């Protein structure tokens, strides 16, 4: 037998060692060859203990006969093993001599303990209590019964403490009580572990229901692995599950699991009150309509009782696939072009409401709300369905916070439909980078290589710059662009996709670098590519990412396969993303196109091609694990099905047709040069994904199976129950509104196949099969779970409902050309696409890739799987854990670092996106859509949704776009007037042939070329060049632009127009605009004339003026309008004050003043976006803040914004109710609780609180929401007022509420209490005597109060208003309302102006515009018989810098080096870093100070806040560090880093001068004017300063 194989082999004792065979220690002798069984081993192999003598026990040969054994060794005993010479092997081999081994047995101490630390699953006393034992004759045990009142705590304490074996403690024992104790005798086999079972049936207390805790006494030398254990023991039980407002109890006897009738079930709450009660039916079911606050169930029958804690968590179902949408009711589809966005971008959204079955429903409004990341609403709108398609479209504010924005929707079911969409800004690049590869594909033997070239845009090499990147290897299935749809390479090939190495290198002085890697695929039979995702890091660490593919062809020509059959968009939950994959009907032939094309795309002749049709197969099998648990493993196997020998000819496309059975398939073809190419395709709709258990059996429970992948109401289901063990229970199709099937008893043995007839009325996708069974085993042999549950989704959505959309777009297209998209809806058998609607759109792939955005699928949106509608609960043993469902991963979240870096200084990035209006397909289902693509270079993803009534569809297709030639100008973001700049026009030739370009440069607007346009420009392929374009900015504010028209190109076989690019940039004058404001009343015969010296400074090109004339004193509303409009900064008060003129003016009224402006629709839209801008500033408490939502509340400004919002609501503009409500609550808080307010900068707190209370009283009184008692209490403290304005507002507030007497007293007192003239006294009301007189004037005229005083107040206000040189936005607004009050005041007048021959005349005030020529010689005489008031407001930009000056405020600027030494502005090199040092002082406190420092052009701001200490370098100290420390002490209210200026709101202290610091970098070479540093109080304009500055700044290359 075995002796033959062992023949000729010498016998040898290979080993002698103790091993733990079974539970026993065992001596083992391992011989080299098998032994003879017949021999008496006791005669030949002695074993003698040194003390106790010869050891008992016969030897036991191994089945392999090479291992002798001796069980039940004594612990820690010395042993002498004498092996005899005469021992015989099966081949009659024998030892040459006797051997004497010695061995000391391991010191194995006796052990005893419970088999487990415990479990919550109920058992029976007959089952006994398991106990592992080893060499232990006894074990004392102390039983305990936990107090039910302490039960919830004890078990909780049992949960986190059970990790260690000795979890028992006195604190735990005190919550329990002793019931029995005593020693249990044991007789395990000697030196052998055994699972003994402690009897429990003679213990009387154990007969009673309850949880129990056994605790072994640890006396003696015995080891104790598990001293304590827990076990529940109870009788009657209940099982149930709820569906929102409904629940279905199932009572049953625990002895058999059979359903019991007549049990009474009460619904107790947390208070224990009985909300309801019901008796079980014959099937034991007890339906009840309980919603939330369900707590306890109380079953009772024949004295038996059982409670169920509903408050306990529902049984975990993570192992089950219960995931899905929660829209069981009406389904509002919400979809858009992209989930990613930028601040200032126009978010777009589309909606499609449908029923649960996806059927059409009558049109209804839907309330959309735009939530912010803080959770506060931004805006709310009542969306409407035009032609059955909802379409939101709103513009994000530039200042809007970055984060996870979402737009909730309300269909009226009060279940909001969240729609998350990313909103993040991006920093502009500042370094060019290039990663050139090879055009011709590499051989597999060839080393991969890439050339890197990076350089600064301002004109320097990236010397020493870090370059970090990654190298990826990917299959090149689409190696031939000339033959789209064809696939190349073996799909069956393994390791075609893996990371190579992490590139990281330093560029040389030239900035050049190389990236090379050795080939690791020399034996490849398939095309491959090595992507190089490099990144050129800045000194600040910001990287310029770039990619560079490199084709790798195994041979000069390769086989290529195409699938003619359409790829239907099968859904997959594995990626939560519908995607089209190739497929074909079972039993049908599969066509395929075959080619032998090269890289050029021309087809080469070939013969002997090996076209095989491999048939893929898979076999699932479950597998338990420790670190992984149970898993759904599967084995794959390939089997050849058929073979063919194709012989392609030159310029020919072969067409094979292989018949197909079912399941996964793979068609391969092998070229003679060992090239291989293959394409997988599935014969069934039941597509399988990786790590997806399409058909496998999980341990225990019920692995339900369906005979069909999908079902219809006319279809009959046949579920296959397969419980591990026999047990009664139930099965049913549960739904969100409740179960379909009710009772359904089941008694599985080793599997059962019940038939399920689906009803026709089931128009829902939320249906879910469910099963339960329980084993009544008297003795729990091999453990085995008692309860078992099986949930499975039931498919129902028909395939026919899907539309076969078929987009047709070119694979490639030129930039600035209109892409065409052909639509073709269809369906099998039907082929009747009636009135189909399609919504074509296109988005850049580089935007969608950041979030891996999926094309929306309406079919999945409606017919897709819904989430489980029930919540399981039962007293049976708790589910293990299930470890949770498997989860996908990418690379985590993004967009956090930019927040750390601060807000970007207005990026110029171009986000390509398009969405054409929805179109109706014709009778053939054919359609077309033309999208006008702009100047863009990259892949462009096209997407298209389609819909009718119940039919739905979706499709997508890539469209590459590439320009023949690249042309990128590099210019400063802005240019000051008179500045010169050296532009650099980059030009790249990516074409394979040289070009002779002709660049006709041109300029327009406030810009002018210095040099003549360049002549011919030769350009070799792959070569970039840089034209130099000197330029100069024309004087005055406005826009400038540079056009370029490259000509030539000369592309064979393709006519094309010459390139046309344009570059527009702003032109802001280096100095602030100056104004003159004359005004006087003329007696008849008198003549006024403008002083000659008043216009000497203004440049004629920028100068402009206005001349008002009236028979009564006037106000120049046009000036207030122009000033409110001209203000740039976005703080709240300035925003509202700038919003009022838009609110009360109209295009006719505006044109009448001679002012030019936007159309009324655009104006109202500006009012809307402005209201959103105001809502952006709102605090969470409903208050408002001056600069940011996180800032301190501004009460008076809160009432101000409340006033503008209310009056805007009076104008019909929409505002959210929640904001007005919270703000009214804030004003009411201002009225009822004055003392909570905090106004630290106020000198007179009582006057401030009185002003806030009064203005809030007015804003509330206008809404009729102000209580009379609060107004009276405020009236009691009338003395507190420091101005008459609050008294007047309080008087209107009193008179409005019917307290006419106190209100009349207040209005009377208000005109008799002038505001203090001392500007130093800060009230915090943002007011002045001018603003107060104007606002009081408007308040008087609006309520028709005291007409006699209105005239004197008007004459005074008119006398004081015109003469001011500077005005706060608040004063400009109050003067605007005051002028609006008097715009139609009668007053005849005549005049004889110098600019007109005809006499002027008017029944009312008139404002004629004037040019500078009219202004220089202006002269107005009063030809009338009555006095003639006149005003003259001119403005313009000075030709030269005004002399530096100061009033209260003081400021000075000091340019510095990075090392902190002084640095002259002249002879500044390009790319130089500089540290600007602003310094501010004041003779008085200036809480509302604003520091403005306009940048000279050629200097560009670094977007870093030095106050936070962030900087390009921290290594420097001394001169720089103390400055940063001083900036740290500054009370900065706000800061900004605009392209043209540095801004910093601050609260200057008289004894603590401010020290502002900021980085800047020279970029573009040229001469530049240098703006003077400026600082000014925002509401006390007279307090202001402008310091000295150098005349020029000469940047150099």
From Swiss-Prot:
According to the UniProt entry, the cross-link of type Isoglutamyl cysteine thioester (Cys-Gln) is at 1131-1134
Keywords, sorted A to Z: Cell inner membrane, Cell membrane, Coiled coil, Lipoprotein, Membrane, Palmitate, Protease inhibitor, Signal, Thioester bond
**Which is one Gene Ontology cellular component term of this protein?**
plasma membrane
**One GO term of the biological process aspect:** defense response
- Coiled-coil ranges (or none): 1503-1533
Q: Which domain of life is it from?
A: Bacteria
Q: Where are the transmembrane segments?
A: none
Q: Indicate whether DNA damage appears among the record's keywords.
A: no
Q: What is its main location?
A: membrane
InterPro entries cross-referenced by the UniProt entry:
A2M_bMG2 (IPR049120), A2M_N_BRD (IPR011625), A2MG_CUB (IPR049122), A2MG_MG1 (IPR040639), A2MG_proteobact (IPR026284), Alpha-macroglob_thiol-ester_cl (IPR047565), Alpha-macroglobulin_TED (IPR011626), Alpha_2_Macroglob_MG3 (IPR021868)
Q: What is this protein called?
A: Alpha-2-macroglobulin
UniProt source species:
Escherichia coli (strain K12)
């Amino acid at each position: 037998k075995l002796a033959q194989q062992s023949a000729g082999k010498v016998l040898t004792l290979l080993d002698l060692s103790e091993v733990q065979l079974d539970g026993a220690a065992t001596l083992v002798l391992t011989f080299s060859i098998p032994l003879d069984p017949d021999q008496d081993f006791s005669r030949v192999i002695h074993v003698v203990d040194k003390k106790s003598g010869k050891v008992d026990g016969a030897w036991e040969l191994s089945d392999n006969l090479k291992e002798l054994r001796l069980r039940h060794l004594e612990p820690k005993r010395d042993l002498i093993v004498t092996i005899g010479k005469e021992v015989k092997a099966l081949n009659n081999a024998t030892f040459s001599k006797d051997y004497e081994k010695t061995i000391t047995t391991r010191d194995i101490q006796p052990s005893v303990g419970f088999a487990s630390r415990g479990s919550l699953l109920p058992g029976k006393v007959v089952e006994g209590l398991p106990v592992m034992a080893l060499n232990v004759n006894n074990v004392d045990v102390n039983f305990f019964r936990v107090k039910p009142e302490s039960l919830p705590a004890f078990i909780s304490q049992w949960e986190y403490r059970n990790s260690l074996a000795n979890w028992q403690s006195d604190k735990l024992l005190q919550m329990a009580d002793l019931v029995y104790t005593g020693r249990f005798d044991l007789n395990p086999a000697r030196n052998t572990r055994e699972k003994l079972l402690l009897p429990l049936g003679d213990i009387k207390p154990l007969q009673q229901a309850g949880v129990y805790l056994a605790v072994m006494n640890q006396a003696g030398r015995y080891d104790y692995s598990n001293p304590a254990t827990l076990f529940t023991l109870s009788d009657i039980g209940v099982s149930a599950h709820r569906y929102h407002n409904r629940l279905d109890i199932f009572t049953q006897s625990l002895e058999n699991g059979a359903a019991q009738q007549g049990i009474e079930v009460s619904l107790l709450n947390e208070k224990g009150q009985t909300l309801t009660q019901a008796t079980s039916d014959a099937q034991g079911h007890v339906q009840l309509e309980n919603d939330k606050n369900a707590a306890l169930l109380l079953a009772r029958k024949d004295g038996q009782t059982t409670l169920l804690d509903l408050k306990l968590p529902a049984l975990d179902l993570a192992e089950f696939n219960i995931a899905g949408a929660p829209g069981y009711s009406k389904q509002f589809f919400m979809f858009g072009p992209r989930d990613l966005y930028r601040p200032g971008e126009t978010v777009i959204l589309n909606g499609l409401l449908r029923d649960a079955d996806g059927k059409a429903l009558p049109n209804q409004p839907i309330k959309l709300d735009v939530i912010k990341p803080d959770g506060q609403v931004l805006r709310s709108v009542v969306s409407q369905p035009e032609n059955g398609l909802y379409h939101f479209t709103w513009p994000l504010d530039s200042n809007a916070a970055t984060g996870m924005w979402h737009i909730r929707a309300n269909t009226g079911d009060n279940q909001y439909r969240m729609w998350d969409f990313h909103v993040e800004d991006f920093m502009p690049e500042r370094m060019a980078l290039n990663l050139t590869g090879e055009k011709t594909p590499l051989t597999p033997k060839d080393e991969v290589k890439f050339s890197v070239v990076g350089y600064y845009l301002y004109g320097a090499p990236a010397n020493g710059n870090t370059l970090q990147g990654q190298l990826f290897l990917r299959p090149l299935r689409e190696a031939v662009s000339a033959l789209p749809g064809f696939e190349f390479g073996d799909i069956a090939a393994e390791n075609l996709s893996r990371t190579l190495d992490e590139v990281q290198l330093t560029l040389d002085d030239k900035g050049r670098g190389e990236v090379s890697t050795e080939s690791q695929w020399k034996e490849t039979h398939s095309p491959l590519q090595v992507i190089f995702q490099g990144s050129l890091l800045e000194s600040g660490g910001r990287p310029v990412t770039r990619r560079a593919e490199q084709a790798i062809w195994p041979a000069d020509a390769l086989p290529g396969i195409r699938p003619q059959f359409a790829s239907k968009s099968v859904y997959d939950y594995r990626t939560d993303s519908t995607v089209k994959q190739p497929i074909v009907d079972e039993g049908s032939n599969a066509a395929f196109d075959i080619v032998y094309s090269d890289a050029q795309g021309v087809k080469k002749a070939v013969s002997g091609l090996q076209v095989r049709l491999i048939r893929e197969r898979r076999d699932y099998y479950w597998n338990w694990s420790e670190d992984e648990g149970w898993q759904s493993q599967f084995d794959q196997k390939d089997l050849i099905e058929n073979e063919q020998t194709l012989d392609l000819k030159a310029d020919e496309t072969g067409k094979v047709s292989f018949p197909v059975e079912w399941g996964a398939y793979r068609l391969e073809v092998k070229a003679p040069n060992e090239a291989v190419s293959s394409v997988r395709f599935w014969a069934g709709y039941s597509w399988q994904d990786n790590s997806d258990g399409s058909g496998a059996v999980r341990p225990d429970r019920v692995t339900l199976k369906l005979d069909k992948a999908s079902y219809r109401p006319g279809d009959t289901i046949k579920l296959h129950i397969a419980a591990p063990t026999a047990g009664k229970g139930y099965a049913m199709v549960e739904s969100s509104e409740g179960p379909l099937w009710w009772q359904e008893i089941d008694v599985r043995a080793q599997g059962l196949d019940l038939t399920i007839p689906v009803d026709k009325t089931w128009n829902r996708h939320d249906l879910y099969l469910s099963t339960l069974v329980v084993r009544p085993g008297d003795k729990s042999r091999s453990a085995t779970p008692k309860r078992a549950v099986g949930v499975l989704h039931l498919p129902l959505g028909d395939e026919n409902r899907r539309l076969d959309l078929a987009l047709e777009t070119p694979a490639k297209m030129r930039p600035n050309q209109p892409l065409t998209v052909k639509i073709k809806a269809s369906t099998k058998n039907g082929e009747k696409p009636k009135q189909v609607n399609v919504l074509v759109s296109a988005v850049d792939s580089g935007v969608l890739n950041i979030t891996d955005y999926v094309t929306p699928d309406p079919w999945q949106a409606f017919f897709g799987q819904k989430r489980y509608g029930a919540d399981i609960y039962d007293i049976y043993g708790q589910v293990i854990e299930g470890q949770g469902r498997l989860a996908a991963l990418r690379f985590g979240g993004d967009g956090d670092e930019l927040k750390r870096g601060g807000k970007p200084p207005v990026n110029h990035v171009n986000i390509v996106v398009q969405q054409a209006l929805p179109v109706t397909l014709n009778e053939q289902g054919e359609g077309s859509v033309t999208l006008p693509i702009g100047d863009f270079n990259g892949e462009l993803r096209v997407m298209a949704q389609a819909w009718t009534a119940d039919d739905f569809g979706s499709n997508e297709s890539k469209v590459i776009v590439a320009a023949p030639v690249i042309a990128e100008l590099n210019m400063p973001r802005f240019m000051a007037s008179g500045d010169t700049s050296r532009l650099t026009l980059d030009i790249t030739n990516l074409t394979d042939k040289p070009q002779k370009l002709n660049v006709a440069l041109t300029a327009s607007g406030l810009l002018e070329l210095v040099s003549d346009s360049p002549a011919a420009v030769e350009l070799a392929p792959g070569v970039r060049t840089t034209l130099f374009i000197p330029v100069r900015a024309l004087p005055g504010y406005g826009d400038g632009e540079i056009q370029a028209t490259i000509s030539g190109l000369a592309l064979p076989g393709e006519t094309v127009a010459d390139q046309h690019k344009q570059w527009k940039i702003g032109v802001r004058p280096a100095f602030p605009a100056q104004t003159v404001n004359y005004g006087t009343a003329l007696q008849p015969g008198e003549t006024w004339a403008i002083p000659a010296d008043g216009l000497q400074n203004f440049s004629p090109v920028t100068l402009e003026g206005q001349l008002l004339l009236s028979g009564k004193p006037p106000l120049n509303i046009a000036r207030y309008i122009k000033e409110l409009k001209a203000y740039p900064y976005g703080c709240l008060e300035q925003t509202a004050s700038g919003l009022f003129p838009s609110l009360y003016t109209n295009a006719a009224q505006l044109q009448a003043l001679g002012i030019k402006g936007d159309s009324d629709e655009k104006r109202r839209a500006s009012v809307d976006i402005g209201i959103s801008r105001l809502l952006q500033m709102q605090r969470d408490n409903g208050g408002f803040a001056l600069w940011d939502k996180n800032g301190d509340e501004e009460y008076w400004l809160t009432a101000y914004v409340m006033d503008f919002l209310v009056r805007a609501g009076e104008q019909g503009y929409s505002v959210p109710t929640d904001a007005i409500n919270r703000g009214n609550e804030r004003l009411l808080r201002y009225l009822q609780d004055p003392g909570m307010m905090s106004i630290p900068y106020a000198d007179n707190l009582k006057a401030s609180k009185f002003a806030v209370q009064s203005y809030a009283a007015l804003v509330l009184a206008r809404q009729q929401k102000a209580p009379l008692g609060a107004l009276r209490e405020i009236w009691e403290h009338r003395a507190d007022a420091a101005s008459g304005l609050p008294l007047l507002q309080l008087g209107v507030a009193l008179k409005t509420m019917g307290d006419a007497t106190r209100g009349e007293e207040a209005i009377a007192l208000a005109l008799k209490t002038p505001r203090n003239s001392d500007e130093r006294i800060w009230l915090g009301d943002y007011g002045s005597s001018l603003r107060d007189n104007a606002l009081m004037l408007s308040l008087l005229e609006e309520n028709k109060l005291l007409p006699d005083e209105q005239y004197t107040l008007l004459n005074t206000l008119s006398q004081q208003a015109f003469g001011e040189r500077w005005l706060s936005t608040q004063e400009s607004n109050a003067l605007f309302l005051a002028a609006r009050t008097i715009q139609d005041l009668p007053g005849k007048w005549q005049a004889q102006t110098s600019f007109s021959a005809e006499q002027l005349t008017g029944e009312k005030a008139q404002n004629s515009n004037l040019n500078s020529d009219q202004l220089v010689t202006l002269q107005v005489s009063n030809s009338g018989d009555q006095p003639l008031w006149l005003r003259m407001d001119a403005s313009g930009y000075p030709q030269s810098a005004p002399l530096p000056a100061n009033n209260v405020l003081q400021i000075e600027r000091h340019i510095l080096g990075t090392d902190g030494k002084s640095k002259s502005l002249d002879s500044l090199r390009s790319g130089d870093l500089v540290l600007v040092w602003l310094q501010v002082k004041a003779s008085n406190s200036v809480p509302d100070a604003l520091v403005v420092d306009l940048l000279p052009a050629g200097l560009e701001l670094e977007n870093q806040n030095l106050a936070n200490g962030s900087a390009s370098l921290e290594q420097s100290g001394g001169e720089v560090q103390n400055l940063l420390n001083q900036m740290q002490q500054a009370s900065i209210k706000h800061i900004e880093f605009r392209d043209d200026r540095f801004v910093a709101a601050v609260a200057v202290d008289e004894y603590q001068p401010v020290t502002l610091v900021y980085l800047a970098r020279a970029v573009t070479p040229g001469t530049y004017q240098v703006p003077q540093p400026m600082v000014e109080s925002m509401y006390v304009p007279q307090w202001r300063a402008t310091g000295a500055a150098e005349d020029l700044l000469i940047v150099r290359p």
